[PDB]
Design a protein around this ligand. Sequence first.
Ligand SMILES: CCCCNS(=O)(=O)c1ccccc1
Ligand SMILES: CCCCNS(=O)(=O)c1ccccc1
Ligand SMILES: CCCCNS(=O)(=O)c1ccccc1
Lengths: 119, 119
Amino acid sequence: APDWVPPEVFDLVAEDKARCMSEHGTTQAQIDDVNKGNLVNEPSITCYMYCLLEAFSLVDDEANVDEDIMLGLLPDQLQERAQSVMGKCLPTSGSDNCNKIYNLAKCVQESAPDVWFVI
Amino acid sequence: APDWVPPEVFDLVAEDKARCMSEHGTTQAQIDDVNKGNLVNEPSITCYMYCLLEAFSLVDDEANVDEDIMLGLLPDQLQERAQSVMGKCLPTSGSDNCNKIYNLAKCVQESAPDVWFVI
Ligand SMILES: CCCCNS(=O)(=O)c1ccccc1
Ligand SMILES: CCCCNS(=O)(=O)c1ccccc1
Ligand SMILES: CCCCNS(=O)(=O)c1ccccc1
């Protein structure tokens, strides 16, 4: 992940990472690819992102981001940049929940590739 | 219903929607509620879902689901997502036909909000 990610997040997500990878057939290799800017629209990775976001209430049942909860989780250092990115990329839109998260990731990647990551 | 639902289904279901709502005392408000994630175990809605499924030959007289045709009628991306969810949530179980379909809908909505919809 990017160097700014708080160490605690790696432990906080561990339980849901395992569950979500199992549920969606996700490989660590796919995850490693999102982080190197190589995102593809395949449910095994896009629904995995949805799954992990939902675990932390970062999105609701229609894959709309909760900006407050997202800003809460992000370090103080990223507040300004993240708020700008959210302004540009939200609300989410797409045919289903996984597509909404794919579309969101692509939007964030355009301006701010280091703000999005997959764990 | 979700944005991914094929346009054709709204016309294809119309005849059976009328018949099934009439048979079960269903109101549109109840159908709207399911699509908002507010599924309640009332036979006027749970038996309605059974009735629509039966109309498409997706259930038999004991609310056994035809997994292969149900999956086959879904768009490609939903079909992929649904393979794992239906793997988990099928076969149906419950005290009667309407409870079996309630339990199925609840199971699907827990993993995959945006997959179980009603018209
Ligand atoms: C801008 C943030 C990116 C979110 N991507 S993620 O689904 O892998 C995820 C990462 C961390 C916590 C929850 C989900
Ligand atoms: C001919 C129209 C196809 C129906 N496709 S559907 O995705 O709405 C669907 C509805 C109910 C069960 C499975 C799929
Ligand atoms: C993924 C399957 C959803 C089934 N929901 S339904 O039984 O109300 C229904 C909707 C549309 C056509 C037939 C049945």
